[PDB]
Design a protein around this nucleic acid. Sequence first.
DNA 1: AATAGATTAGAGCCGTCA
RNA 2: UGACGGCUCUAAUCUAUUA
Lengths: 407, 469, 102
Amino acid sequence: RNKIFISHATPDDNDFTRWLALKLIGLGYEVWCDILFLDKGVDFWSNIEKVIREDTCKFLLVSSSYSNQREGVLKELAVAAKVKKQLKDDKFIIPLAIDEQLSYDDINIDIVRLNAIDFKMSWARGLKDILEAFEKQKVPKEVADASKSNLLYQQIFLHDKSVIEKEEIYDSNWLSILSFPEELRFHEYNWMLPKRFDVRELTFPAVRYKNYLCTFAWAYDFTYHLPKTETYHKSKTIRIPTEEILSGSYDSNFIRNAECKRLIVQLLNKAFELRMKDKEVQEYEMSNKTAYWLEMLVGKQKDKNWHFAISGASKLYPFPVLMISSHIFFTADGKKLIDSSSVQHSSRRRQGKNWWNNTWRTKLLAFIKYLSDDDTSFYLEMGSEEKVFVSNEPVKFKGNVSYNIPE
Amino acid sequence: MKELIYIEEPKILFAHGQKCTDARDGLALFGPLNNLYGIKSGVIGTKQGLKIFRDYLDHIQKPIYNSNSITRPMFPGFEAVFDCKWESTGITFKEVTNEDIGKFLYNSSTHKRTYDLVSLFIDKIISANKNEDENVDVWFVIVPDEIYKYCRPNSVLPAETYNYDAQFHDQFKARLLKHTIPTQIFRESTLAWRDFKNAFGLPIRDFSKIEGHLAWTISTAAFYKAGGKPWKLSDVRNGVCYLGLVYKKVEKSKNPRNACCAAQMFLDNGDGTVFKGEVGPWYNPKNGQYHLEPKEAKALLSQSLQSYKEQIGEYPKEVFIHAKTRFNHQEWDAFLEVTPKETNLVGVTISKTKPLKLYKTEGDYTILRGNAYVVNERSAFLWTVGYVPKIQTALSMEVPNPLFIEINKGEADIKQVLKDILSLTKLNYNACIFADGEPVTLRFADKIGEILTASTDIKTPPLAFKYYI
Amino acid sequence: IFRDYLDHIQKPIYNSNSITRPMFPGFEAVFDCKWESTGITFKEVTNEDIGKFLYNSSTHKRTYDLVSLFIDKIISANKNEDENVDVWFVIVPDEIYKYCRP
DNA sequence: AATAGATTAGAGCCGTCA
RNA sequence: UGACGGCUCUAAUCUAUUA
Ligand SMILES: [Mg+2]
């Protein structure tokens, strides 16, 4: 006889029973409990009686408002009383009172006359009382060990949940850039274009640089805004292919490689802005960037409709991509933004509360797929006969470790 | 297709040489390293504040539960966990009359009233420390909500004292530095939250489901601030030193005059864990620039190397300077002009402003935590926030962001850098959490920097973290 | 020496005459509190410095140096650390006490 | 004094159940 | 200021070019 039998209510006293059973197993005792076993079933009955009758040395009972008048507990108490009579041991059953709502005058007749251990005001002194009682009654025990307790804990709540070797695929918010024009060209309108022309309003993306014009466009493009351009000798156009400056294998006193990359990024950003203007999508000037949204991608929240929105920035590191962000914006009637940034912050904080992974990714891919041009790509028009082609499916990543999502 | 890699959990250490991945589980199973005997507390506050603190102490002597025992381990009582006594009988009271508090919180000037209130409290604390017999391990400052509402720098009210920060907490902690008195600041609505309600009959802050989490946090902070060691790292290698750097702006002066503070961490060689601030604030006169002049860089690195040598007896075999910024060539040349010949100096940059988000294609649960994407031999992304299968939940609510780690200078192995950055997320003694989202070398250095930037009179400050956090 | 002495007085101590000098029944049996060698926080001071200072032949100078040496350590420990220490016991060699008179 | 890109810091509000 | 996380708003500085 080495076991110490703990009786309790299975779904109600689980916390205290687990705590006490693991503490006792750490101290070095041997414990039998129905929360210490997996793969149960026909085990109930025909095995509880055997362990109570032939293995148990002490019968700890957890006394609470739930264990009072419970059939299994009462039957186990009856068997324990018969066993106590069978042996010469009056201190075979030790009630433990924990429920402040169980008055000591409302105890079942089986244990009304027994001396219990109090746990209500604190559990540490109750544990000390149990330990002292066991030492005084010479209950069997081995050398104290708690590594054993940790190992056992693992066998149950760590196997049912750990990481698993499982191949999965993810979606990201990056869109790869597919096409680049062949040769960026600089048109020398040496003191031919007006000095304060504000070249940001032209028909194609342009960027002033020295007395030149940095653009992907064609020599006599944008003639409406610059009338005096037909008389222009085309041989004075300094032509540099895009691949060489992208790979970093170009540098000269006229322009460095980093500067070329920066101007290319500027051109890409302006082209994206102009195209989104072409797409006829609403704007939203954020603190430093601009967002876009549609007048499910639109829905309701009490008196305010929520609008999924995106913002896009183009980068050349790690690889040429167009990174996307996700936002929510709110309107009084689906057409006019509320002119209150604090209200927008509060609404966006309380609306993304219930949006999980799938919601975010599905809405993002729905919005991006809506901008697709024909079948699988989306082009940014850099000139009359120049385009930059961008993908409509985000980049995938692969991994070999995952979890089992055990509900 | 791009390939990801996984990094295993670092594990932490507890009493009896037992390792675990969680601090709550390992504290409930095994217990802390050292043996305290009991916490004797000094409580300065109003009468109702004293009653509130007493009631809270009477509340954490018993088990306290959360709503879910898997997502959040429960609290089995202070003495069950920490094997020491912290009870509401070893308390000394220093009354603060409410009339004074009302008097000083009206001057229509944030700086002046903040200075007056901090003076009010620290006067009593200092007098009690100097001229009395009772011994106090930690001082608990109970603060009404009206004081907390109007003392923020951007707080509206519906010269001599202007050389101080307009924040009560930082000024209070800085003006007590030259006395070295550990203290814990509590709001009145934090210990008795059920009583403070909004105009609907419900608590403003609802802790009903996370009471055990609050008990864990408060108990761990009180235990650590009284000289307790809750846990330590289990696989720190020998001869490696970790050095954090963070910049703050000394506002409220003619010169913004950026300042720099560092935090240090290495192995004791007694199998301990030396983790203390390394700070004498170093300055850069030029505005907007976050780089050290050669003199300051030489001084900082020399001091850190000398501290390591004195503790250990030899110079380090490797120094990792974690930072939130890049280094320039003057900075690193100054750094390299004092480092010993046979030492390796690596400068890492940890950045958070880099858009990238991975979405699982099927479920409503985010990416696994310890995943990483290696762009290049000198760069890689790292997910320190994400799903943790142990607790059947994630450390965030929306899709988490990764950290962009870059080996800016030196020559190292990026995989080992990621492995070391992930383990440093397991030392937030200022909280009781599963794991942090940022290395603690860059967080406690920031806390120190924001503490000793609210005053100008501080000289040779203390380095033990219990006087700042 | 301090650890030895603290361990000694945890048990009852008697005198030769129990009428003139009532016994000591042990520290905790009397004062109802715990004071053992588990709540100590040592601060080693190398004998090299102490020996070096106590040779200057000028009493005021060496007294100043010794006091500065000790109080710097005590104040640093008080201020820059999270440890709670109530009474700071100072164990001083005999030669320091002897040679610190006007 | 303007136009960019690219990098830094500071405040301040909201959610944590299910 | 018991934590942590995610957002939004507001400053700088550097680099190239133009005036
Ligand atoms: Mg704290």
